[PDB]
Amino acid sequence: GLKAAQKTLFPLRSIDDVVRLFAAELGREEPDLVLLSLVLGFVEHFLAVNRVIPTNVPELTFQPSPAPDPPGGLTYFPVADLSIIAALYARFTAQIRGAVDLSLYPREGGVSSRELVKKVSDVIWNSLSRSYFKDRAHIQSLFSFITGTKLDSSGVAFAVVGACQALGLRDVHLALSEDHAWVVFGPNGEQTAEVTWHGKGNEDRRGQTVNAGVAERSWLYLKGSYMRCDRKMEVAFMVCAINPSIDLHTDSLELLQLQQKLLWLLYDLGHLERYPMALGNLADLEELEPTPGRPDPLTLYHKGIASAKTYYRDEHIYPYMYLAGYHCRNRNVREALQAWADTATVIQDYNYCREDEEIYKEFFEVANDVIPNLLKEAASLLEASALQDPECFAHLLRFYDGICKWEEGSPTPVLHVGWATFLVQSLGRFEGQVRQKVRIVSGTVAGTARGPVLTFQSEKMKGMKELLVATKINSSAIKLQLTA
């Protein structure tokens, strides 16, 4: 069951009570992923999923507390009894140990066999409802798995890792790219296995190694530069997986505070160190309700970016989109365009393919909708500035440069006539005066001995560096140049 050192922290009657359980558990050698998820799923349940308080359950109670700001009010918190949580912990533990016989598998000196890993995978896989939409909120925790039998894509891989911990396996860890999750194991942890589906269509890639996706240079596996989690990072994941969202437009104030505090907790113990996405997540949270005494969002986005550069060969994309998004919100045109340019710079070394849909859509919305709506806006301030800055126009070409370089060597075409119309319209938003102060040099002298400058890496963009910097924009020719 639960060790007595865990039990004494119960019951939790507030957010602060929960943070304590998390600090306590993070100081152990083997943080209890199962215990922690169950608490998170339990508290998310009554704060996001069923905010209506039950009236005929003598077991479940709620804790009254002083309202946050002027509005209201008494905020009620779902008190997590020990008996409730212990029963859930117990049922999960039973399920697994029941279904698998560690006798049929000899652990070779702290080494879990691959047949063992597939087995634990199946146990989870075969345990989940056939009947549900996998694309909704509040089905990430083990609370969800044990209660309703529903788990979203990434949640399955977390479930498989928590289940291995329940069996005392300690070499099976969570592998984590930016839009997919799987498992790493073996001695020194260079064995991998798919354990969940990905995307809209459920193509089960499970049982397979990951080598194929690393090889195809797809953004899903990050050229082999994905995160290999330790127990402490798996706790950070959980905290990120917290979903404060009640409605499409409404969010739970306590679930936001909880995720915020838990992220700070992690930050301080140096656990966000290697987790760019957690850093940006935390940054976004700070922008909404800054806690006094702490660093700026902008600081944090850069830590995230720093982390990506140090630990993952600057091969990640979200840390920039986090930043870009920030500026795009505070209407900082130049910093937006720069950060988007940096994003494309990272993507240029990838190939595009079917399963990279999540990121394709992001470049598409940025290129076709978010940049145009943002230029058009500034087209109206100087009419009563950035539309008069060659750095921004250069930031923009660097953007379409990275995207053209993406398309290169890729199975499916990235560009089509739909991208062209808005490239044409975005350029046109700049004065010939301005477009011309930018010089597209090839590189004068390679190496070193003892307006602004821009150099293209893609054939398309350099093939037409003349039409871009012209005075009439040849709409028709620029369009023919983006296809091949």
């Binding site: 694309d135 909704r136 909120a137 990430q140 979203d152 894509s153 990434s154 930016e178 839009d179 994941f237 959980m238 990120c240 997986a241 917290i242 987790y275 996405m277 957690a278 940006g280 997540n281 976004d284 979200y318 989109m321 986090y322 870009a324 998004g325 795009c328 999540e358 992001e362 919305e365 940025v366 909708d369 978010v370």
Partner: peptide, 12 residues
């Protein structure tokens, strides 16, 4: 966007 820690879509 459901992947934990993923950033908000830049659009609307």
């Amino acid at each position: 966007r459901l992947f934990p820690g993923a950033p908000p879509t830049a659009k609307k």
